[PDB]
């Protein structure tokens, strides 16, 4: 038998309990794995049983809850279940430019835009999902769509205006 351990932060405990009934149900009716929510160590234990096949799905089961740990939506997390080749890449904002204080706060603003329109446009065009931490940016999607979204995200934080990135990323969508 094999077992995986998944940490959960204290800020992620509230939506984990609120969206709990739609998390273990795909594990039991379609995946055939037993899970438990260890309150004492604040870990999610996933382990095999006598009812499991398709040993490739164990790693996918670990990547299922890890996506919800980082802040992705539930329906975006089950999108990892039914697809087979999806990867997640993360990087900090200051991994590409030293930004301090007010400049760092405006870097997050240019990624989102008014009402998240700039993020949603990149989300809709590259067919990926982007979530924003305090300084980290996590992108989930197919490998070629990651490099297209990472190129648009980096050009946003260089200071190229969101109008130019909105216009350019729709022309690149024709390939």
């Amino acid at each position: 038998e094999e077992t995986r351990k998944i940490p959960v932060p204290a800020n992620r405990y509230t939506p984990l309990k609120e969206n709990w009934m739609k998390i273990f149900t795909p594990i039991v009716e379609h995946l055939g794995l037993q899970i438990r929510f260890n309150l004492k160590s604040r870990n999610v234990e996933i382990r095999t049983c006598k009812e499991t096949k398709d040993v490739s799905a164990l790693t996918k089961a670990a990547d299922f809850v890890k996506a919800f740990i980082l802040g992705f939506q539930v329906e975006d997390a089950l999108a990892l279940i039914r697809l087979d080749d999806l990867f997640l890449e993360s990087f900090e904002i200051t991994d590409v430019k030293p930004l301090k204080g007010d400049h760092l706060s405006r870097a997050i603003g240019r990624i989102a835009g008014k009402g998240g329109k700039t993020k949603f446009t990149i989300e809709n065009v590259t067919r990926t999902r982007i979530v924003l931490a305090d300084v980290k940016v996590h992108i989930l999607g197919s490998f070629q769509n990651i490099k297209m979204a990472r190129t648009a995200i980096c050009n946003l934080i260089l200071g190229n205006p969101p109008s130019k990135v909105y216009g350019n990323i729709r022309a690149v969508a024709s390939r």
Binding site: E2, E89, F91
Partner: protein, 135 residues
């Protein structure tokens, strides 16, 4: 040929899935990290600089070590992901996630999966300039 261990117990090794921006290293060695067994790069599989760091390149790199290790007797490997570290990024790229999923398809039982990157207290100055980002 192989270790003199019965079928009940398995021999454990470690691997260093060093997934940089340019290729993906799959380095399998002993528990001390002193005696090496197999080490393939992205240039072993595909003779093309386009897919030097592709998940497909790491998938073929991970499998060919897996068929190499099974006649050496080791069917259990510990996992050590690694990114570039230092000044550069910290989270490992998608090449490491591809190679982890690829070598698990060979049926070898898995050990402990954890991240080892050269985390600085703080590094020295960045390779990029004050203005310079990736692109």
């Amino acid at each position: 040929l192989g270790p003199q261990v019965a079928e009940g117990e398995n021999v454990f090794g470690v691997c260093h899935i060093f997934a940089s921006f340019n290729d993906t290293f799959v380095h399998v060695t002993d528990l001390s990290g002193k005696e090496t067994i197999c080490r393939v790069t992205g240039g072993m599989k595909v003779k093309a600089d386009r897919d030097e760091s592709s998940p497909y390149a790491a998938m073929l790199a991970a499998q060919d070590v897996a068929q190499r290790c099974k006649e050496l007797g080791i069917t259990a490997l510990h996992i050590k992901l690694r990114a570039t570290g230092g000044n550069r990024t910290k989270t490992p790229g998608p090449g490491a996630q591809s190679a982890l999923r690829a070598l698990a398809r060979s049926g070898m039982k898995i050990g402990r999966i954890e991240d080892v990157t050269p985390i600085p207290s703080d590094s020295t100055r960045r390779k990029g300039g004050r203005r310079g980002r990736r692109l």
